[PDB]
Amino acid sequence: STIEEQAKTFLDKFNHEAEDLFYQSSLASWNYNTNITEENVQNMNNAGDKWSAFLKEQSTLAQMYPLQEIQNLTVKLQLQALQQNGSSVLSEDKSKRLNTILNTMSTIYSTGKVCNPDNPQECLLLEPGLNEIMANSLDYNERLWAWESWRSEVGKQLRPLYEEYVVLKNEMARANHYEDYGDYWRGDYEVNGVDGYDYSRGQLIEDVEHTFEEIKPLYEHLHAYVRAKLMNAYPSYISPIGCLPAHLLGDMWGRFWTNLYSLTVPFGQKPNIDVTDAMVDQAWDAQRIFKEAEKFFVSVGLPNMTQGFWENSMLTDPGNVQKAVCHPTAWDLGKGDFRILMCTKVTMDDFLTAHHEMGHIQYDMAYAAQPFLLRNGANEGFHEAVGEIMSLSAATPKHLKSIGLLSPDFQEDNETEINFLLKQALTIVGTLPFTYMLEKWRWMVFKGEIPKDQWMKKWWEMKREIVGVVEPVPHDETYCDPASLFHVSNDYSFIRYYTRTLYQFQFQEALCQAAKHEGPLHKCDISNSTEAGQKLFNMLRLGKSEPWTLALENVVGAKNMNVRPLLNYFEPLFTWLKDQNKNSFVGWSTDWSPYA
Amino acid sequence: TNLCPFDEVFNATTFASVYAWNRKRISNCVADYSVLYNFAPFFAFKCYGVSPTKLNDLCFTNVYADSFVIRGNEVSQIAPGQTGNIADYNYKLPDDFTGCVIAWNSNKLDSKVGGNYNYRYRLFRKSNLKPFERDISTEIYQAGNKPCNGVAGVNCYFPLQSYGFRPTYGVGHQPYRVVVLSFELLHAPATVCGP
Ligand SMILES: *[C@@H]1O[C@H](CO)[C@@H](O[C@@H]2O[C@H](CO)[C@@H](O)[C@H](O)[C@H]2NC(C)=O)[C@H](O)[C@H]1NC(C)=O
Ligand SMILES: *[C@@H]1O[C@H](CO)[C@@H](O)[C@H](O)[C@H]1NC(C)=O
Ligand SMILES: *[C@@H]1O[C@H](CO)[C@@H](O)[C@H](O)[C@H]1NC(C)=O
Ligand SMILES: *[C@@H]1O[C@H](CO)[C@@H](O)[C@H](O)[C@H]1NC(C)=O
Ligand SMILES: [Zn+2]
């Protein structure tokens, strides 16, 4: 009996107990999110505390099977994911400080409120009080109020916490043998022991920056074009060679530019494709929406939704008195129980999201054969991108025409395609410099390159240089404007959103090529292509049991993340942007500011 | 003369854990195999060596109605020359097995919203099961090289695990009530007959 065989048996007992407990934790969380009551709250806390205590126990019994003497990479990957210590490596005092700070910051953000200056009685939460102003208001000072107050009320409180958050999170990483917290986060992409498919953690930074270089010309043209339209709607405020003020970007931060479609639409006369009205006329409900989604995956060769999926999922708001969290989520409870919790209305947005979340379910069903610890996306960015490419094909004029939601007498002209691409680029291309710069700032904070008295100074330096976005009000080192974003004050790695973006276009470009689509990549519909579904599936079924680089190659034929499919998808918009920006300045200056 | 108690093996209130597969030896009665359908959601009737079509034509020395419960995924394991946790360590069928396999989904009966931990299988065992053996031993299984001293612990895992059939489970994890009908054939008078 070697130690590899003891680990093989240790994981076997684990895999059967972990499946049982995780099923109780998932079913307890499902009951809370579907029925919120104070009694359901209590049981989600109990099962989630038994599962958190069982995992904590099993890790210690696993550190006794050295990874060096284990050679089967599947067994190594399970032990490595089980041997994680994390907060445990910190003292029972520091491991309690960190859990307090994470709890306090998560409560400061979510419960963070700012009250009217003229009316100190009227207050607003971020959602849906200030997020509502950022998306839909088109005033200047009303936007500047919410943008500043959120960062000065919520952000300033978070600043001392984030300083202690950084210190302890580093000590957690430096005791699991990582350089810093950012290095610990980059361990998601790491691969060791598989020659030709290895991937170091430092390679991610080289990849992310090198790829972003190729994004730059497209972004500089989308930025210049967006600036010109924004300069005509805020005439006295926006310079023709300067950065966009941080509050005029569509949301509280500028993460997505999707709300600027009203002010930036190229051919606003030409309408947007909105099949919402057509769904009402044909008497569609949520049942039909997911059935049409189930039909889409069957057409590419994927299995139909499990019989349990239709019996237990929540496809409409129960409404009345039974309340719920309506955030669309896909649930892999395990043991063959798959479920979607979606408060669906009969609109086009929910039609596409149902395709997106069911893509998650199809991914989950695929690797359901794998061992417990390996049931996940190849890396973090895989799972979201597998759902995103579903909404890419499903929203195309082809798929809408083939399902009877768009009449075949509707004709696509080169202008509605430009309208389509730009609304995508505001959402997709616009978030790439935001995502890369934010995770760069946090990465540099953890490594110690940015001292504490330069936090907000280096932040807004990098927001100008990379994002091309300028703060409307100068900030000292009492603010923490990153911490005003959920993913920063709630301890979530952010580079996954950059990698997921580039992944999805690699997949969609590979799937369409297997589907023999001819034309631009943004017009493609992988429907009915069993070859495409096969190519996707042989990555879906792998789960985490393979290096993400091998998983990526099983779809797109390349071992590494690439930006060319993203550029290829957006090229018709790119050359058009190079036209509309003929007599406009392309680029920005980092020393302009609306605050003089 | 009298009817073989197939109602017993096929309609009992409780069946067995597969590790303790329960056998009702059948002899000197009349076999009426056509009754074997309880209107179940997922019914399987594979037979080997014999012909399930007109099964009420062949006498046998004995019929051994081995009954138990397993989850759906493992139903395929109840078959000659299979592998997996069930057939390796719990209930093996021989190579030239001459009988029948009859299973059906039982999530209605054997599941509970809290979880039915009554049905067990055998997760670990030291040697593969010779055909039609039964290991009802609770020997604390030594996976390592230090003796386990009859007490569980490190590399001393208890050799029996529960199923926890909950109703919200999936088809491949729901409890399935298997009935094997091993048809013995010796030189004996072969008293198990009947059209
Ligand atoms: C998680 O913590 C355990 C316990 O500290 C680590 O294993 C120990 O490492 C120390 C290092 O000085 C050794 O002296 C012990 O022999 C180890 N085993 C035990 C049971 O304590 C383990 O390495 C940590 N895991 C990671 C990934 O850092
Ligand atoms: C690793 O273990 C799995 C599961 O037992 C097995 O299928 C695989 O063959 C093993 N690895 C190698 C290289 O054989
Ligand atoms: C779900 O919530 C409702 C509130 O209307 C409550 O009456 C019901 O008991 C809850 N579900 C269960 C299983 O108790
Ligand atoms: C078996 O039991 C079920 C449920 O009690 C009953 O409906 C059925 O008639 C029984 N079949 C026989 C042959 O007794
Ligand atoms: Zn998603």
Author numbering:
A (entry chain A): 19 to 614
B (entry chain B): 333 to 527
From the paper:
Receptor binding and immune escape have been recognized as two major drivers for the evolution of receptor-binding domain (RBD) of the viral spike (S) protein, which is responsible for receptor recognition. Receptor binding is a key step for SARS-CoV-2 infection. In this study, we evaluated the binding properties of BF.7, BQ.1, BQ.1.1, XBB and XBB.1.5 RBDs to human ACE2 (hACE2) and determined the cryo-EM structures of hACE2 in complex with BF.7, BQ.1, BQ.1.1, XBB and XBB.1.5 RBDs, respectively. As previously reported, the binding interface of SARS-CoV-2 RBD in complex with ACE2 was divided into two patches.
Moreover, the crystal structures of BF.7 and BQ.1.1 RBD binding to hACE2 were also solved at resolutions of 3.46 and 3.40 Å, respectively, for detailed molecular interactions. The phylogenetic analysis showed that BF.7 could evolve from BA.5 and gained an extra R346T substitution. The R346 site is a mutation hotspot, and previous studies showed that it plays pivotal roles in immune escape and receptor binding. BQ.1 (KD = 19.07 ± 4.08 nM), BQ.1.1 (KD = 14.70 ± 0.37 nM) and BF.7 (KD = 13.37 ± 0.29 nM) S proteins to hACE2 are comparable to that of BA.4/5 (KD = 14.37 ± 0.41 nM). Based on the ACE2/RBD structures of these sub-variants and a comparison with the known complex structures, we found that R346T substitution in the RBD enhanced ACE2 binding upon an interaction with the residue R493, but not Q493, via a mechanism involving long-range conformation changes. From the structures, we found that it is R493 but not Q493 that is regulated by R346T substitution through long-range conformation alterations.
